[PDB]
Ligand binder design. Structure first.
Ligand SMILES: *[C@@H]1O[C@H](CO)[C@@H](O[C@@H]2O[C@H](CO)[C@@H](O[C@@H]3O[C@H](CO[C@H]4O[C@H](CO)[C@@H](O)[C@H](O)[C@@H]4O)[C@@H](O)[C@H](O[C@H]4O[C@H](CO)[C@@H](O)[C@H](O)[C@@H]4O)[C@@H]3O)[C@H](O)[C@H]2NC(C)=O)[C@H](O)[C@H]1NC(C)=O
Ligand SMILES: *[C@@H]1O[C@H](CO)[C@@H](O[C@@H]2O[C@H](CO)[C@@H](O[C@@H]3O[C@H](CO[C@H]4O[C@H](CO)[C@@H](O)[C@H](O)[C@@H]4O)[C@@H](O)[C@H](O[C@H]4O[C@H](CO)[C@@H](O)[C@H](O)[C@@H]4O)[C@@H]3O)[C@H](O)[C@H]2NC(C)=O)[C@H](O)[C@H]1NC(C)=O
Ligand SMILES: *[C@@H]1O[C@H](CO)[C@@H](O[C@@H]2O[C@H](CO)[C@@H](O[C@@H]3O[C@H](CO[C@H]4O[C@H](CO)[C@@H](O)[C@H](O)[C@@H]4O)[C@@H](O)[C@H](O[C@H]4O[C@H](CO)[C@@H](O)[C@H](O)[C@@H]4O)[C@@H]3O)[C@H](O)[C@H]2NC(C)=O)[C@H](O)[C@H]1NC(C)=O
Ligand SMILES: *[C@@H]1O[C@H](CO)[C@@H](O[C@@H]2O[C@H](CO)[C@@H](O[C@@H]3O[C@H](CO[C@H]4O[C@H](CO)[C@@H](O)[C@H](O)[C@@H]4O)[C@@H](O)[C@H](O)[C@@H]3O)[C@H](O)[C@H]2NC(C)=O)[C@H](O)[C@H]1NC(C)=O
Ligand SMILES: *[C@@H]1O[C@H](CO)[C@@H](O[C@@H]2O[C@H](CO)[C@@H](O[C@@H]3O[C@H](CO)[C@@H](O)[C@H](O)[C@H]3NC(C)=O)[C@H](O)[C@H]2NC(C)=O)[C@H](O)[C@H]1NC(C)=O
Ligand SMILES: *[C@@H]1O[C@H](CO)[C@@H](O[C@@H]2O[C@H](CO)[C@@H](O[C@@H]3O[C@H](CO)[C@@H](O)[C@H](O)[C@@H]3O)[C@H](O)[C@H]2NC(C)=O)[C@H](O)[C@H]1NC(C)=O
Ligand SMILES: *[C@@H]1O[C@H](CO)[C@@H](O[C@@H]2O[C@H](CO)[C@@H](O[C@@H]3O[C@H](CO)[C@@H](O)[C@H](O)[C@@H]3O)[C@H](O)[C@H]2NC(C)=O)[C@H](O)[C@H]1NC(C)=O
Ligand SMILES: *[C@@H]1O[C@H](CO)[C@@H](O[C@@H]2O[C@H](CO)[C@@H](O[C@@H]3O[C@H](CO)[C@@H](O)[C@H](O)[C@@H]3O)[C@H](O)[C@H]2NC(C)=O)[C@H](O)[C@H]1NC(C)=O
Ligand SMILES: *[C@@H]1O[C@H](CO)[C@@H](O[C@@H]2O[C@H](CO)[C@@H](O[C@@H]3O[C@H](CO)[C@@H](O)[C@H](O)[C@@H]3O)[C@H](O)[C@H]2NC(C)=O)[C@H](O)[C@H]1NC(C)=O
Ligand SMILES: *[C@@H]1O[C@H](CO)[C@@H](O[C@@H]2O[C@H](CO)[C@@H](O[C@@H]3O[C@H](CO)[C@@H](O)[C@H](O)[C@@H]3O)[C@H](O)[C@H]2NC(C)=O)[C@H](O)[C@H]1NC(C)=O
Ligand SMILES: *[C@@H]1O[C@H](CO)[C@@H](O[C@@H]2O[C@H](CO)[C@@H](O[C@@H]3O[C@H](CO)[C@@H](O)[C@H](O)[C@@H]3O)[C@H](O)[C@H]2NC(C)=O)[C@H](O)[C@H]1NC(C)=O
Ligand SMILES: *[C@@H]1O[C@H](CO)[C@@H](O[C@@H]2O[C@H](CO)[C@@H](O)[C@H](O)[C@H]2NC(C)=O)[C@H](O)[C@H]1NC(C)=O
Ligand SMILES: *[C@@H]1O[C@H](CO)[C@@H](O[C@@H]2O[C@H](CO)[C@@H](O)[C@H](O)[C@H]2NC(C)=O)[C@H](O)[C@H]1NC(C)=O
Ligand SMILES: *[C@@H]1O[C@H](CO)[C@@H](O[C@@H]2O[C@H](CO)[C@@H](O)[C@H](O)[C@H]2NC(C)=O)[C@H](O)[C@H]1NC(C)=O
Ligand SMILES: *[C@@H]1O[C@H](CO)[C@@H](O)[C@H](O)[C@H]1NC(C)=O
Ligand SMILES: *[C@@H]1O[C@H](CO)[C@@H](O)[C@H](O)[C@H]1NC(C)=O
Ligand SMILES: *[C@@H]1O[C@H](CO)[C@@H](O)[C@H](O)[C@H]1NC(C)=O
Lengths: 122, 461, 122, 122, 48, 49
């Protein structure tokens, strides 16, 4: 768990399932245990719900048919995936998040309606 | 070649423990929201249960290591305490009582006693002299007595008692125990189930049947009956300190009554709290008792002897009285209406059975009835003092209650002198043995719906 | 529910979806009701999380690209799938489980990274 | 959220994902907040479980290989998807829901076992 | 618990009731005494 | 957590409201052993009656 926190972005591309493995199920104390048990379920289900809204749930690595804007782009692919780590990325890219998320959501629904219209026109 | 595959939803299970919850049977609780077992808070079982027999399934059972009976015991204790919590506490009543006499002569049983005291009014300064009739097993002569007429309560040197609220009803509403989703309750279906050991017929269910939490020692009351044969259950049948649960096939009817017309008066204690006691007895004074048919009880003891002689072969068994002890231990405890009876049972468990079928009086018919006398208490210290003591308020008018008998709690007192006659005495007091006779069929399991198997088929990549 | 507990494995190939439809639908009693309500959600989400980590979630029958070792193998396919029941199988196979689960997890992540590298090299 | 409640059926086919992203994220008051937190998880997981049993989970629009019975059919496609909103439909089609759902469940399991037998015969 | 002290207070007229069995005397009790024991509000609690 | 654990441990135990009475106290360790600190106090306790 979290063994590749200091490695590169590509080097975390083989061990990104061990973070998802431990994400669930890792009267004062009864109250604290009950609150922890509800909190873990909420924090897992929120990430799963966002991944389902983007439509690429069920897999760890996605491709989302949406262009990367030049206002977010600052480096090359070797510079990003061979020099920078994921925590530095989360520090530096974290703005413009909701716009990206809504764009992914509407792109997924556009894909669904286009595929359904293509199969209905078959 | 052979590739590993996983299946979701396999029908397997494993033994586990969980917190089952209550579920009632959708009884009308629009006005009776005052039950002591709080059954209106249970989930209403509107549909029929999923009664499915599996087929070709064998499962091993052992009910003396069940956790359902321990959970049900803890639920009964906590329900009793949380029902008894907001009621009146009888701390200002533990005073010096002057008790002369209430019944005119000895009568039937002169258990009434006319005790007077100085109660406290709403005003903290003025105290008022008041009287009430108390039963004899509730009052003790006061310490350092020169055979005087000073009496205190039984509980004053042990623990303060809170009385039951008068709107609280002790009626045993049936309770269904249901497993959470993801678990199941597997039950036996052998009509001659030992109690332990495997079963060849197992069915699945989510909720148990409507068991009645009936509290009584010695004889069991209002229970479920066996199917075709009397079933004798024990842990070992050779350890003499193990209670034998005898499960009858035909119920025996008992009629219990307190015939003297009793009244009720309310004594104000403090601001807003009353105390209900016996005010007077109107009419003659008669004896509280219970009635069983003698022929049916003899036939039932004879059939229990028939079923019990095959576990102790070439021997004569002999029923006897209860052992030495207090009234709450020896006497058959009982509760109908709200008054807590304690019946004698010395002429009931009296006789013997050898191998020969001694009496064929079932061919004839008789109206002879065995009558056993019962005393009545007010202050109870039930479940061995793990729960709080309660003062049961008195009930005006006479009390009657019809009931059935479906089980017995026997014990053995064998020895070296018992080489031909075997002694079986009534015993009880461990209250989870009452609920082991209703949870004998059931077991709780946890479903594990992930399975691993090879199919000789590879993933398309 | 559990109607094919004593049948064969292949006879459970049509009734494995009814064991998956009853897994979520069903102040002392308030406490017991609350604890049962949390326990059902936890026991459902653990199985769904394991299926998602293996990568074959969303379907009942999977194939996992991992060879069956001879130390786990004792019978033929007809002997397993036509004579033995699932409970006897679960009794007799239950060892060597977490290494199987980790093998499936790393195989799923290898499949994901290989598919992403194939689509990136397109 | 719920912006297309009065629009047509087709016009709700582009805004059915905004009503799926608000379904999870949103001592007297502590008790009420805890009960609300558990109810949100239960009401989300029930719909996700039914979508998993029908086999079309992970997407918003499905096709389920099951014929539409004439006892349920009363209108044409233009009348349904261009004149009537979803509320009148939910009012009028609500019978035979359990048998429709069971038909979808058995059809999904039949599809799974047929696909597994096809890949095993490969 | 032994020493009691005489203390006065000014009570509003609807709160006090003449005592039971009064010969038009000057003995008064609280209104709530024969109904239910009554807890005062804490002074730091605001009813806004 | 320490405060609440302490409070729930002291919740069901014996309260000493009836002990707060007038105590008549005389010295028990009257000797000059430079310890003292033990005062013999008597009072009128309340029995069960
Ligand atoms: C159990 O024990 C209790 C108390 O220990 C007994 O209760 C008392 O019983 C006596 C005897 O019946 C009662 O005395 C009678 O009370 C009647 C009404 O009571 C009012 O009047 C008396 C004054 O007489 C007041 O003291 C009382 O507070 C009430 O205001 C009276 O009408 C009776 O008077 C008649 O008899 C007397 C002689 O005794 C004559 O002098 C009178 O002129 C008149 O003819 C009588 O006084 C008493 O009230 C009861 N209560 C109390 C609190 O003491 C139970 O009787 C006893 N047994 C049972 C079975 O419960
Ligand atoms: C084993 O099982 C049997 C069968 O249930 C039990 O016997 C019952 O015992 C209970 C008491 O524990 C009895 O309940 C009481 O019945 C009284 C008589 O009811 C009859 O008469 C009235 C008026 O004529 C009719 O309306 C009624 O339908 C009956 O025909 C009632 O007076 C009692 O009322 C109490 O409750 C109500 C509602 O809360 C209050 O308004 C009353 O004031 C009062 O408090 C009460 O209902 C019951 O009748 C018995 N049944 C039988 C068939 O005899 C045994 O008790 C049980 N064994 C053990 C050990 O529990
Ligand atoms: C701290 O303070 C307390 C109280 O303030 C002291 O406790 C008392 O100490 C005295 C002195 O020792 C005790 O008195 C003695 O009691 C013995 C047994 O007690 C019984 O008998 C007496 C009657 O004598 C009863 O009053 C008592 O209730 C018991 O029933 C007696 O055997 C002693 O009698 C002998 O001495 C007397 C003279 O004092 C002679 O007349 C007798 O004939 C006999 O020879 C004596 O009475 C007293 O019992 C203690 N308890 C109480 C409650 O008063 C502590 O001593 C003090 N110090 C410390 C360190 O704790
Ligand atoms: C207080 O004591 C009263 C006096 O005994 C109790 O009344 C008795 O209640 C029982 C209920 O178990 C009744 O038994 C029933 O009797 C009928 C037959 O009824 C016919 O016979 C009676 C004889 O008195 C007669 O009164 C009727 O009008 C009928 O002609 C049976 O069919 C039933 O199965 C059942 O056995 C007694 O009959 C009844 N006695 C009287 C005199 O009314 C009363 O129940 C007690 N109080 C309480 C609260 O229980
Ligand atoms: C104590 O034992 C009594 C007999 O020993 C029981 O009385 C029997 O209860 C049965 C169940 O309630 C009754 O069966 C029902 O009878 C009615 C009336 O005819 C029918 O409509 C019902 O269909 C029928 N139930 C079923 C499942 O068939 C018996 O009629 C009744 N009497 C006899 C002589 O058997 C008592 O119930 C039992 N318990 C108590 C608390 O008294
Ligand atoms: C309840 O309260 C009443 C008061 O209304 C108590 O009655 C009083 O009891 C005392 C004894 O505790 C009586 O004192 C006795 O006086 C006689 C002489 O009359 C004397 O010989 C005795 O040795 C004793 O000192 C007192 O007279 C009596 N009455 C009044 C009006 O004070 C009563 O004891 C209390 N308890 C009970 C259980 O009733
Ligand atoms: C609280 O007070 C009651 C009443 O005084 C105490 O009950 C008493 O307990 C003793 C000891 O068990 C009993 O003595 C025994 O009596 C039997 C006969 O029943 C006799 O065979 C024994 O040899 C022994 O002497 C006594 O009878 C009993 N009192 C009554 C009225 O039943 C109780 O023990 C006290 N509890 C505490 C914690 O102090
Ligand atoms: C239950 O009922 C039975 C019988 O109705 C009671 O047994 C009997 O109790 C009496 C007590 O009045 C015994 O009488 C006395 O026994 C003593 C001790 O043996 C003896 O020394 C006296 O001379 C007198 O006989 C009587 O023996 C006894 N047995 C019989 C057969 O009558 C029993 O006490 C009741 N209660 C319980 C809790 O069992
Ligand atoms: C009711 O059941 C009892 C026992 O279950 C039957 O009574 C028993 O009958 C036998 C012989 O008829 C008695 O055996 C002999 O009794 C005398 C009496 O002193 C004794 O001296 C002999 O050594 C021998 O043991 C037995 O004691 C007796 N048990 C009793 C009375 O408790 C009875 O026949 C049955 N009644 C009906 C109507 O079914
Ligand atoms: C507790 O004590 C208080 C004070 O004694 C009781 O309040 C009293 O209640 C009675 C009955 O409602 C009142 O009598 C009525 O007075 C009106 C005039 O206001 C008159 O028109 C009626 O015909 C009737 O006589 C009485 O005035 C009232 N006392 C005061 C000072 O207002 C109360 O009922 C007691 N509660 C219990 C549960 O005992
Ligand atoms: C505990 O209770 C006892 C009673 O058993 C108290 O003892 C009594 O105390 C009073 C004073 O509060 C004594 O009264 C005194 O009488 C003398 C004349 O003898 C007089 O000169 C004084 O001015 C005062 O009035 C009383 O005699 C005494 N004994 C009895 C039997 O009543 C005791 O004070 C209570 N408290 C403690 C801390 O012990
Ligand atoms: C195994 O147990 C089941 C359940 O008790 C038995 O099925 C019952 O059979 C009786 C026939 O006497 C029917 O009246 C019941 O309706 C059946 N139960 C259910 C839930 O349908 C079954 O007969 C038993 N089989 C054996 C061989 O003992
Ligand atoms: C029921 O048990 C009592 C237990 O005391 C038996 O009474 C004893 O019987 C033996 C038989 O010889 C005597 O030696 C004892 O002295 C008796 N004890 C007492 C206290 O009396 C009684 O016999 C048993 N009943 C039957 C029918 O055997
Ligand atoms: C057990 O039953 C027998 C008879 O059924 C009782 O013996 C009779 O008891 C009565 C009264 O005690 C006597 O009048 C008879 O003389 C007795 N007959 C015989 C043959 O002994 C016996 O008392 C019962 N046991 C108990 C403990 O009551
Ligand atoms: C039957 O029950 C008795 C007593 O409970 C026990 O000793 C015995 O071993 C049981 N037999 C079987 C086969 O379970
Ligand atoms: C025990 O009783 C049975 C039947 O009464 C009999 O067949 C058997 O021989 C007896 N046992 C002995 C050791 O006599
Ligand atoms: C059993 O007891 C009865 C009592 O009358 C007697 O007739 C019979 O002979 C006894 N049988 C045996 C085997 O002792």
């Amino acid at each position: 768990f979290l063994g590749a926190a200091g490695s590169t972005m590509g080097a975390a591309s083989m061990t990104l399932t061990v973070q998802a493995r431990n994400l669930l199920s890792g009267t004062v104390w009864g109250i604290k245990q009950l609150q922890a048990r509800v909190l873990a379920v909420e924090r897992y289900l929120r990430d799963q719900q966002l991944l389902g809204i983007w439509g690429c749930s069920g897999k760890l690595i996605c491709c989302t048919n949406v262009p990367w804007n030049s206002s977010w782009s600052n480096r090359n692919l070797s510079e990003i995936w061979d020099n920078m780590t994921w925590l530095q990325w989360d520090k530096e890219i974290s703005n413009y998040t909701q716009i990206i998320y809504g764009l992914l959501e509407e792109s997924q629904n556009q894909q669904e309606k286009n595929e359904q219209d293509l199969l209905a026109l078959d | 070649n052979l590739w590993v595959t996983v299946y979701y939803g396999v029908p397997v299970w494993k033994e586990a423990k969980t917190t089952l919850f209550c579920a009632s049977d959708a009884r009308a609780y629009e006005k009776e929201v005052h039950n002591v077992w709080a059954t209106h808070a249970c989930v209403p079982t509107d549909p029929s249960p999923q009664e499915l027999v599996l087929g070709n399934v064998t499962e091993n059972f052992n009910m003396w290591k069940n956790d359902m009976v321990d959970q049900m015991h803890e639920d009964i204790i906590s329900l009793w305490d949380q029902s008894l919590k907001p009621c009146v506490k009888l701390t200002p009543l533990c005073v010096t009582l002057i008790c002369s006499d209430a019944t005119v002569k000895t009568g039937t049983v002169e258990e009434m006693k006319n005790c007077s005291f100085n109660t406290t009014t709403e005003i903290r300064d003025k105290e008022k002299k008041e009287y009430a009739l108390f039963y004899k097993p509730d009052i003790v002569p006061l310490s350092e007595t020169n055979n005087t007429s000073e009496y205190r309560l039984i509980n004053c040197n042990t623990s303060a008692c809170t009385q039951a609220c008068p709107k609280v009803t002790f009626e045993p509403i049936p309770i269904h125990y249901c497993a959470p989703a993801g678990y199941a309750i597997l039950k036996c279906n052998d009509e001659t189930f030992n109690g332990t050991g495997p079963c060849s017929n197992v069915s699945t269910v989510q909720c148990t049947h409507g068991i009645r939490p009936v509290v009584s020692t010695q004889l069991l009351l209002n229970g479920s009956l066996a199917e075709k044969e009397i079933v004798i259950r024990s842990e070992n049948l050779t350890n003499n300190a193990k209670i034998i649960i005898v499960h009858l096939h035909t119920p025996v009817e008992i009629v219990c009554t307190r015939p003297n017309n009793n009244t009720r008066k309310s004594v104000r204690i403090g601001p807003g709290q009353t105390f209900y006691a016996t005010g007077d007895i109107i009419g003659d004074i008669k004896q509280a008792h219970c009635n069983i048919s003698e022929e049916k009880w003899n036939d039932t003891l004879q059939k229990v002897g028939i079923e019990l002689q095959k576990h102790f072969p070439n021997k004569t068994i002999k029923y006897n009285q209860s052992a030495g002890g207090d009234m709450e231990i020896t006497t058959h405890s009982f509760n109908c209406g709200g008054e807590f009876f304690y019946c004698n049972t010395s002429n009931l468990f009296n006789g013997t059975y050898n191998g020969t079928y001694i009496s064929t009086n079932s061919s004839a018919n008789s109206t002879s009835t065995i009558t056993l006398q019962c005393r009545i208490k007010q202050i109870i210290n039930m479940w061995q003092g793990v729960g709080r003591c309660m003062y049961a308020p008195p009930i005006a008018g006479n009390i009657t209650c019809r009931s059935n008998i479906t089980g017995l709690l026997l014990t053995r007192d064998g020895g070296t002198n018992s080489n031909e006659t075997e002694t079986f005495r009534p015993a009880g007091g461990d209250m989870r043995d009452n609920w082991r006779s209703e949870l004998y069929k059931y077991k709780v399991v946890k479903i594990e719906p992930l399975g691993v198997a090879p199919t000789r088929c590879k993933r398309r990549v």
